Design a protein around this ligand. Structure first.
Ligand SMILES: C[S@@+](CC[C@H](N)C(=O)[O-])C[C@H]1O[C@@H](n2cnc3c(N)ncnc32)[C@H](O)[C@@H]1O
Length: 327
């Protein structure tokens, strides 16, 4: 969590915003794909990720932050002109806006609601676990994303389904663990919400400090996970080989790392499943890519070193990535 291209921008961010930020990991890609995008942070809080996003999307982009708590947004807003000046040489030239609302129902957020297909990228940091109606939430994300858009986001997940007890406990819930999805239910909910393709970006385990909290969660292993879920009509629930390849064309990195399974060296054509090709093709990523035309259909994609895992269920991709304190 927290790469070095971001670490420079953090430094420039207001003290108050930083001291009052309560985050999971990184909910922002490090690769320069953001220039000019419209970002929306769900449960933005005091505005760390928003202001971070504000630099990355640059002068031509937009960041909208959304939160329910008057007091959190109070802090956030206080630093609009501040950061406008700090990043673009002038106050009153910021690309940052804040709405008051519940993330399950962005159409009624204030001062104005978030219309359909108005957002390139939706991010959130450690927020979604707190929601009492996840399907509604993921459906809301699907609604506001444009086609080609994606949900890039951090949150806390689980090895397994917690007990009835564990799920009712408010200390646990508030500690961000009680509302944490079993990884398999997550895959299922988000597919039901319209996202048939879930890309793992980074994990790392989440310890349980307080032993009295652990009592409710005896054997459960928790994780922190960042996931891309592009909204592209033609995605499928399986990753199919149409013999294609993609070639990253440079202009935003030596490489381009898409998710744990896919990295594209500048001018190396890399073999991709049709799902991947579609994503690259229909999202903003097309600018720094060319994608081969689809051949005949060879069954489930294999042209990848870890192709075995690429087809394994989500909770296995994770566990098998996680075993490894060999740094
Ligand atoms: C984990 S914390 C703060 C993390 C925040 N993303 C940050 O980096 O500062 C929970 C935050 O999400 C907000 N929140 C929780 N549930 C929400 C909901 N249904 N709608 C809007 N905001 C919510 C809380 O107000 C609080 O700002």
């Amino acid at each position: 969590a927290v790469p070095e291209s971001h670490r420079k921008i953090l430094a420039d961010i207001a003290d108050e915003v930083l001291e009052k930020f309560y985050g999971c990991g990184s909910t922002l890609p490090a690769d320069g794909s953001l220039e000019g995008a419209t970002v929306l942070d769900l449960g933005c809080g005091t505005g760390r990720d928003v202001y971070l996003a504000s630099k990355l999307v640059g002068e031509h982009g937009k960041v909208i932050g959304v939160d329910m708590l008057d007091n959190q947004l109070e802090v956030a807003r206080k630093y609009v002109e501040y950061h406008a000046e700090k990043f673009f040489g002038s106050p009153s030239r910021s690309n940052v806006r804040f709405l008051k609302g519940f993330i399950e129902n962005l159409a009624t957020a204030e001062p104005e609601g978030v219309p359909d297909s108005s957002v390139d990228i939706v991010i959130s940091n450690c927020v979604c676990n707190l929601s009492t109606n996840k399907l509604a939430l993921f459906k809301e994300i699907h609604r506001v994303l444009r086609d080609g858009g994606e949900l890039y986001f951090s949150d806390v997940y689980a090895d397994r389904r917690l007990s009835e007890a564990a799920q009712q406990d408010p200390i646990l819930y508030g500690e961000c663990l009680g509302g944490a999805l079993y990884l398999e239910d997550f895959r299922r909910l988000v597919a039901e919400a319209g996202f048939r393709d879930v890309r793992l970006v980074s994990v790392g385990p989440v310890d349980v400090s307080d032993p009295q909290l652990r009592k409710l969660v005896p054997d459960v292993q928790f994780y922190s996970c960042t996931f891309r879920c592009f909204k592209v009509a033609t995605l499928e629930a399986t990753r199919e080989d149409y013999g294609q390849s993609a070639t990253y064309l440079g202009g935003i990195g030596e490489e381009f790392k898409l998710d744990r399974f896919f990295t594209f060296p500048r001018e190396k054509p890399v073999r991709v499943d049709r799902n991947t090709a579609e994503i690259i093709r229909h999202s903003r990523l097309h600018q720094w890519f060319s994608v081969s035309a689809e051949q005949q259909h060879m069954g489930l994609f294999k042209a990848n070193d870890s192709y075995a895992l690429l087809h394994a269920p989500l909770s296995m991709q994770v566990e098998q990535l996680v075993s490894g304190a060999a740094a």
